[PDB]
Design a protein around this ligand. Structure first.
Ligand SMILES: Cc1cn([C@H]2C[C@H](O)[C@@H](COP(=O)(O)OP(=O)(O)O[C@H]3O[C@H](C)[C@@H](O)[C@H](N)[C@H]3O)O2)c(=O)[nH]c1=O
Ligand SMILES: Cc1cn([C@H]2C[C@H](O)[C@@H](COP(=O)(O)OP(=O)(O)O[C@H]3O[C@H](C)[C@@H](O)[C@H](N)[C@H]3O)O2)c(=O)[nH]c1=O
Ligand SMILES: Nc1nc(=O)c2c([nH]1)NC[C@@H](CNc1ccc(C(=O)N[C@@H](CCC(=O)O)C(=O)O)cc1)N2C=O
Ligand SMILES: Nc1nc(=O)c2c([nH]1)NC[C@@H](CNc1ccc(C(=O)N[C@@H](CCC(=O)O)C(=O)O)cc1)N2C=O
Ligand SMILES: [Cl-]
Ligand SMILES: [Cl-]
Ligand SMILES: [Cl-]
Ligand SMILES: [Cl-]
Ligand SMILES: [Cl-]
Ligand SMILES: [Cl-]
Ligand SMILES: [K+]
Ligand SMILES: [K+]
Ligand code: NA
Ligand code: NA
Ligand code: NA
Ligand code: NA
Ligand code: NA
Ligand code: NA
Ligand code: NA
Ligand code: NA
Lengths: 397, 397
């Protein structure tokens, strides 16, 4: 039996990995998105992965002709018409709790509309947009400071889990379906948000504006920009200016304060670059006063470098420990899968200071992770003939 | 103590009536809206009422200078600045459950946003838009086929009741306040809907389109118009056309059927004029097949004439009884307060057929209501020297 995975990003990669691991009786095929040109970013290129793992890449037109197959879309970019296949084993993951939020921008709209929850849905593909019957779905709450990025990452994670949970049933044909209700069905088109001329409506309440701010916060794509300042989170003040909504009450390097329909708002300028630099050699005290929101402690640059990665590469031990205490992952990775341990190893090698490792191991540092090339820190130390450091690191269980 | 009532419509009229009835120790003043030019419509002119009841009409500028006063806005049209008064006894009724739906078009927005409920709020006036502290509020559910008109009428009714309930406390100064929360505060401006170029977004789900249809249904102002057809309600079909959303699948004198993102919709053309004509002399059977929604049975023309009024004026007895059985008010009135009984009297007079009255009295017909001029059916029969009919009608308790 053939399984065609059509789509992109870590959902398509991780689903495909689980299949390779778990279901060896299956002949796998890939259909990729037009904009996937082989470059990893915040999400892995499914194209690059398939080529490296010897998964044959086929066109959509080819997939139509494959008989004895299941077809599974995961953030795929082309409309699929059920009529064009010999069979009805055509499945999709959509990033909403259907029937709500059919269509586009499902990491923004629920936030813009102040939903309490969202979810992910596995359903049949039918001819229309996210209209087909439901096989399974899972819901989750939206956090108070949820952004489009944090939301999208929850969708990737939950979607991957729902596919793996259901795939044996999709394969066996032993699943149930329920037609989507018309009631509380909703849809947004690509015209509904112009990401290339995004404007925040300031003639609104504090809460409405901060909803918009957070819905448009997705660092890899954009930050919201107000009065020529990139914004990273904000807060609602207790003051209530009489000035027209949108009036700039205060503007400095740190923030803007605006009048709204109700309560004044304070919008924090983005200082992520400054946070990264500070993590090289400054104290947790210093950093705690530089940041305006603790959200900034979990941000990543275009390579995936985070505060804790920088701290680790520079052997800034007090900052590593402090970040961990704020809930940062001691085993964080950049976008190539390089781990905190690998960066810390670099510091040990460069400095000759091995004394900090034990502390990190006790805080949960995992030496046995593999990066996107399938190599561990040990594989690198061996390749580079850093045998003394290898052997030192090897003493930790 | 002085009480200034600033505003419009039946809220301002009915509140003022209760004051006249209940609180004779009070010196009343009126401030009217710029667009109130003395003409009754679906709502009474507050200007006309004040002139007839010898309530002095003053300017807003005059109201600022009145000391020892309370000021109460009821759908008033001009911004009131607390700074301009000697006192803080400045109160407003807003047609939403604040802090949600500050601003405009509160009979449409909750429907457009598929709210479960709305409400009315009595609050202090502060300098901004519907921002001041809450004194009281009441909530209610939205009906499944709620329209902007039905909603607005609930607001008028509930608002009037909340003012009367609270007015003794406003007068005594013995009320409590709570500041409005920032959370779930929302606002819409006059730019948010263009009633002079209203377009229904058809590239949406069946449910989204019917939400829009109903939010824009307010006969005195407009009906929604699609493909040059005025629409009065619709329904969601079980069919699901593949054609682009908004495609007209069928168009005839009765309805349009459109493709949507999900389920096809059927939008009923408005046939209210035909319903009114039918009520002159056609059977309930006939009328039941002419209507496409029972909502049409409760509609009124620009004078306030309804199906039951027409039936009564024409002595269409089977239609009167049938309408009552569908929940129509046997004591319905036009916009001048003329009642079903008054119209039925006209039929009796014209025809000489007195036989139907007893039936209507047993169904709840009230002979003792007064119109907007303060006259009953008896007052008219006496004035017109229709003594035989007067005396006949007088036998019913
Ligand atoms: C293009 C874009 C997107 N975003 C946000 C909002 C969006 O929900 C999230 C992920 O973006 P994406 O994967 O381009 O597009 P979207 O979520 O609309 O996904 C849609 O298109 C894809 C290809 C379909 O398979 C999917 N089912 C659709 O929902 O990132 C931004 O913040 N800025 C952007 O410029
Ligand atoms: C002008 C207009 C209104 N409507 C609907 C929607 C609106 O909520 C309802 C009553 O209209 P209205 O009283 O002009 O205006 P609105 O409800 O926006 O009230 C607003 O303005 C008045 C003067 C303020 O005191 C009030 N607090 C505001 O909410 O009728 C229509 O369907 N068509 C229209 O053309
Ligand atoms: N049948 C089907 N339904 C879907 O919802 C769907 C699939 N297939 N396949 C994968 C993905 C494809 N989604 C889309 C959505 C819109 C356009 C498109 O070309 N739209 C028009 C209109 C723009 C808009 O309103 O969004 C365009 O001109 O771009 C293409 C692919 N998708 C589910 O994820
Ligand atoms: N202080 C105060 N707040 C209010 O919300 C309020 C009052 N007073 N008095 C009665 C009524 C007045 N509402 C309004 C609202 C807007 C405009 C006005 O002129 N607005 C601008 C902007 C348009 C818009 O965005 O709606 C305009 O140019 O028309 C006037 C009166 N109103 C509460 O009912
Ligand atoms: Cl894409
Ligand atoms: Cl090494
Ligand atoms: Cl060595
Ligand atoms: Cl007005
Ligand atoms: Cl008479
Ligand atoms: Cl007589
Ligand atoms: K303000
Ligand atoms: K359709
Ligand atoms: Na990528
Ligand atoms: Na199922
Ligand atoms: Na767009
Ligand atoms: Na801080
Ligand atoms: Na009027
Ligand atoms: Na109170
Ligand atoms: Na408008
Ligand atoms: Na009918």
């Amino acid at each position: 039996m053939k399984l065609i995975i059509a789509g992109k990003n870590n959902i398509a990669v991780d689903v495909t990995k689980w299949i390779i691991k778990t279901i060896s009786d299956i002949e796998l095929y890939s259909v990729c998105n037009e904009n996937d040109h082989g470059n990893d970013s915040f999400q892995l290129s499914f194209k690059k992965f398939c080529i490296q793992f010897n998964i044959p890449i086929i066109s959509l037109e080819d997939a139509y002709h494959l008989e004895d197959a299941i077809f599974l879309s995961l953030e795929f970019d082309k409309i699929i018409h059920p009529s064009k296949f010999t069979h009805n084993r055509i499945f999709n993951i959509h990033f909403s709790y259907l029937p709500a939020y059919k269509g586009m921008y499902t990491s923004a709209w629920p936030i813009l509309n102040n939903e309490q929850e969202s979810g992910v849905t596995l359903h049949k593909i039918d001819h229309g947009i996210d209209t087909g019957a439901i096989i399974d779905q899972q819901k989750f709450p939206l956090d108070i400071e949820e952004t489009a990025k944090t939301l999208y990452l929850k969708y990737i994670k939950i979607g991957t889990e729902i596919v793996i949970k259901n795939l044996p049933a999709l394969i066996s044909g032993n699943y149930s379906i329920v037609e989507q209700s018309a009631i509380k069905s909703s849809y947004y088109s690509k015209k509904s948000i112009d990401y290339k001329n995004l404007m925040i409506d300031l003639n609104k309440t504090a809460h409405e504006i901060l909803q918009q701010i957070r819905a448009f916060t997705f660092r890899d794509y954009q930050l919201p920009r107000i009065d020529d300042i990139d914004i990273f989170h904000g807060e609602i003040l207790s003051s209530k200016s009489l000035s027209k909504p949108g009036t700039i009450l205060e503007k400095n390097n740190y923030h803007l304060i605006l009048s709204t329909i109700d309560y004044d708002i304070k919008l924090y300028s983005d200082n992520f670059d400054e946070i990264l630099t500070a993590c090289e050699d400054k104290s947790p005290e210093f950093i705690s006063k530089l940041l305006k929101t603790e959200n900034i402690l979990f941000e990543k640059n275009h390579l995936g470098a985070s505060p804790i990665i920088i701290a680790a590469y520079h052997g800034n031990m007090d900052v590593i420990e402090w970040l961990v205490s704020k809930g940062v992952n001691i085993n964080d990775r950049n976008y190539k899968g390089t781990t905190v341990a690998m960066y810390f190893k670099d510091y040990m090698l460069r400095s000759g200071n091995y004394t900090g490792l034990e502390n990190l191991i006790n805080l949960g540092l995992d030496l046995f992770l593999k990066d996107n090339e399938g190599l561990s820190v040990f594989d690198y130390m061996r390749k580079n003939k850093n045998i003394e450091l290898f052997n030192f690191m090897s003493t930790f269980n």
